[PDB]
Amino acid sequence: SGFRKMAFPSGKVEGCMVQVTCGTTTLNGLWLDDVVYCPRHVICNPNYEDLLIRKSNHNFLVQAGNVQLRVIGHSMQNCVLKLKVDTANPKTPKYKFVRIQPGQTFSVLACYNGSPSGVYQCAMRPNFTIKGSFLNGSCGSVGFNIDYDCVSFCYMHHMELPTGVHAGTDLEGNFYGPFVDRQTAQAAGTDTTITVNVLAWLYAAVINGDRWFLNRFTTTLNDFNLVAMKYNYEPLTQDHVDILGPLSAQTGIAVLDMCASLKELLQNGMNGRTILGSALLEDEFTPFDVVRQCSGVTF
Amino acid sequence: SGFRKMAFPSGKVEGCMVQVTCGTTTLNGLWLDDVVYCPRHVICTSEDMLNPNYEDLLIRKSNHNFLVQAGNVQLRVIGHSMQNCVLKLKVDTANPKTPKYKFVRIQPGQTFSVLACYNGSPSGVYQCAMRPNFTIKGSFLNGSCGSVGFNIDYDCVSFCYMHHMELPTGVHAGTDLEGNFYGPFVDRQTAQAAGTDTTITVNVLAWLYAAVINGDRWFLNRFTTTLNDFNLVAMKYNYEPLTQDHVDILGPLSAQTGIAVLDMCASLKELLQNGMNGRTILGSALLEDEFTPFDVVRQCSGVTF
Ligand SMILES: Cn1ncc2cncc(NC(=O)[C@@H]3CN(S(=O)(=O)CC4(C#N)CC4)Cc4ccc(Cl)cc43)c21
Ligand SMILES: Cn1ncc2cncc(NC(=O)[C@@H]3CN(S(=O)(=O)CC4(C#N)CC4)Cc4ccc(Cl)cc43)c21
Numbered sequence: 076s077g078f079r080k081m082a083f084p085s086g087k088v089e090g091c092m093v094q095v096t097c098g099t100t101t102l103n104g105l106w107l108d109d110v111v112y113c114p115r116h117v118i119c120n121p122n123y124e125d126l127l128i129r130k131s132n133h134n135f136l137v138q139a140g141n142v143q144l145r146v147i148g149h150s151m152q153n154c155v156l157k158l159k160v161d162t163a164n165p166k167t168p169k170y171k172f173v174r175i176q177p178g179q180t181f182s183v184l185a186c187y188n189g190s191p192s193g194v195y196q197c198a199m200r201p202n203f204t205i206k207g208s209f210l211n212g213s214c215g216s217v218g219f220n221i222d223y224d225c226v227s228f229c230y231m232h233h234m235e236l237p238t239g240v241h242a243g244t245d246l247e248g249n250f251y252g253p254f255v256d257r258q259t260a261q262a263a264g265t266d267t268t269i270t271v272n273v274l275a276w277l278y279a280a281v282i283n284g285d286r287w288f289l290n291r292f293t294t295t296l297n298d299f300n301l302v303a304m305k306y307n308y309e310p311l312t313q314d315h316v317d318i319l320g321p322l323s324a325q326t327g328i329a330v331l332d333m334c335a336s337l338k339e340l341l342q343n344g345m346n347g348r349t350i351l352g353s354a355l356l357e358d359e360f361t362p363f364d365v366v367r368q369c370s371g372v373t374f
Numbered sequence: 375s376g377f378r379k380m381a382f383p384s385g386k387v388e389g390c391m392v393q394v395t396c397g398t399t400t401l402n403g404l405w406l407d408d409v410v411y412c413p414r415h416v417i418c419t420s421e422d423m424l425n426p427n428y429e430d431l432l433i434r435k436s437n438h439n440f441l442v443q444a445g446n447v448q449l450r451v452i453g454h455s456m457q458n459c460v461l462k463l464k465v466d467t468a469n470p471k472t473p474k475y476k477f478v479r480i481q482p483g484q485t486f487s488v489l490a491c492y493n494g495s496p497s498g499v500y501q502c503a504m505r506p507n508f509t510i511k512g513s514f515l516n517g518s519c520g521s522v523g524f525n526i527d528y529d530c531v532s533f534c535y536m537h538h539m540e541l542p543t544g545v546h547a548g549t550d551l552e553g554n555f556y557g558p559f560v561d562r563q564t565a566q567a568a569g570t571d572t573t574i575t576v577n578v579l580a581w582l583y584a585a586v587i588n589g590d591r592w593f594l595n596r597f598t599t600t601l602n603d604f605n606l607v608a609m610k611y612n613y614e615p616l617t618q619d620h621v622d623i624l625g626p627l628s629a630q631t632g633i634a635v636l637d638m639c640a641s642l643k644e645l646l647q648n649g650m651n652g653r654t655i656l657g658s659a660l661l662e663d664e665f666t667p668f669d670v671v672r673q674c675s676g677v678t679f
């Protein structure tokens with residue numbers, strides 16, 4: 076029993092974290108095989124190819140624990156800088172670079188000076204920002220999932236927006252959202268609630284004995300989406316309904332039956348009650364996270 | 375900016391997790407140097423649990439009855455002894471991944487990271503607190519016994535908890551790494567129940583200071599309170615008494631934000647009376663008690679917004 080916001084074990088990622096210094100700027104890098112990946116803003120209206128062309132390999136100081144790594148090459152790929160080093164990381168895990176979609180969750184290993192300080196779980200918001208916890212020096216910190224024994228890197232931290240939310244790129248340097256890596260006026264768009272995730276969390280509550288919100292009613296998908304659009308909830312698609320199939324079979328509650336519970340919660344509130352110790356509807360657990368935590372899958 | 379429930383990186387602990395099997399029971403063990411630590415109930419059957427006589431069950435076991443597995447490698451058990459509710463298995467190989475470590479016994483209100491494991495394999499990491507009734511609100515399924523709780527301030531791992539059981543309310547009970555239980559619990563399937571749980575007052579106050587540091591002040595008021603009047607009100611909402619030690623401990627956060635501890639207590643009294651009125655504090659509609667004053671100082675910036 077119990078339901079916690081759970082992150083993946085971070086050990087395979089800790090063995091990849093390094094410190095990258097260029098002039099007065101210091102941030103984090105991801106050392107995989109003989110390449111260190113880091114935000115290209117470490118070299119800083121920027122003209123990144125012009126700033127990069129005047130740098131030599133010896134201008135980039137890379138530190139792995141107490142050892143200095145020797146930079147033998149450098150190149151850019153979108154908003155990520157790739158530093159070729161002389162030594163392959165002996166701790167390189169089996170890995171892939173994957174681009175995630177809004178609604179998908181991942182673990183963040185927050186780092187300062189190439190040293191990991193914490194691990195937390197979060198979700199890519201529909202507005203492409205993440206509600207992270209980052210201070211100055213956290214740029215280059217990464218987001219990941221573990222599938223079997225392979226680390227799938229999906230996020231690299233680059234910046235904080237004026238509302239305190241965060242923006243970054245996949246490991247190929249492409250930003251999530253309409254953001255750019257420069258000091259200019261940027262703002263997160265209006266956000267929405269991840270509907271398929273709230274439904275998954277309602278199923279997790281039912282699995283844990285919290286059933287007060289269940290009702291005899293059902294709804295059509297179209298009527299649910301008309302209601303959901305009024306409360307700034309993302310539209311629920313037939314793919315989401317299919318994805319919630321296993322949880323629906325385990326608890327005996329049809330997805331559209333759970334949608335009618337969600338509709339009543341939106342129009343009437345919780346009436347002084349909580350669900351899994353929360354007075355708000357939680358949207359940072361995917362259907363897969365609910366199944367994984369309520370089954371004990373190991374890495 | 376931002377405020378998350380954050381766990382310590384779990385790598386130093388992952389390299390210590392092993393699987394321990396004794397007959398039909400399989401649980402997790404912590405391999406440090408040449409010793410594997412695990413709950414002594416690994417020697418029990420489900421029947422034995424009503425009234426186990428561990429000394430009698432243990433004397434009947436030999437070293438080769440305990441099967442220890444570290445990854446794909448079988449470790450050879452060369453000795454065994456019981457220390458309180460923990461079994462210590464002497465093995466013939468020292469763990470090369472043994473970090474710098476200490477065994478520490480924590481007090482209620484303290485937080486720690488839990489690396490939940492099944493079959494000696496880590497599945498997840500989460501943050502939690504030792505409740506005032508000595509239980510933890512964990513996320514543990516069958517096979518998670520032997521999973522550990524820890525803090526990693528600097529480069530040394532301080533092990534503070536080993537998981538042993540789930541009580542009927544779904545909450546969890548366990549021991550320090552010397553095998554002493556937290557709370558009046560026994561590793562016996564006898565009628566046991568968690569005492570009435572209370573809110574960790576010093577932690578809610580720390581979290582209200584974290585909201586001020588991150589730029590939120592809507593909940594503050596022009597009032598102050600005496601410590602005694604605060605406790606008289608707090609106890610009516612099932613909040614733990616706030617002691618002078620707690621007031622002293624909140625000193626640094628009080629100096630950083632410029633809000634006296636008893637002024638923050640007045641704001642807490644008012645939140646308990648009024649609720650939040652549709653507002654949130656650090657993205658939460660409930661008052662959060664699983665962040666200590668030390669966690670707030672570690673996670674937050676030294677410059678108030
Ligand atoms: C400085 N700082 N504080 C916290 C924090 C967390 N993550 C990243 C940070 N850094 C950035 O985001 C940097 C610096 N900044 S800034 O304006 O100082 C950031 C700010 C805002 N809004 C918090 C005050 C400009 C900028 C522009 C582009 C890119 Cl790619 C990076 C950056 C963090
Ligand atoms: C079986 N199980 N499911 C989840 C879980 C989490 N942690 C520990 C577990 N195991 C125990 O707690 C065991 C077995 N049980 S039990 O009755 O099956 C526990 C239960 C309840 N209530 C969850 C179903 C008795 C008991 C008594 C004392 C000690 Cl030391 C160990 C144990 C977990």
Ligand SMILES: [Cl-]
Pocket residue numbers: 479480481484
């Ligand atoms: Cl303590």
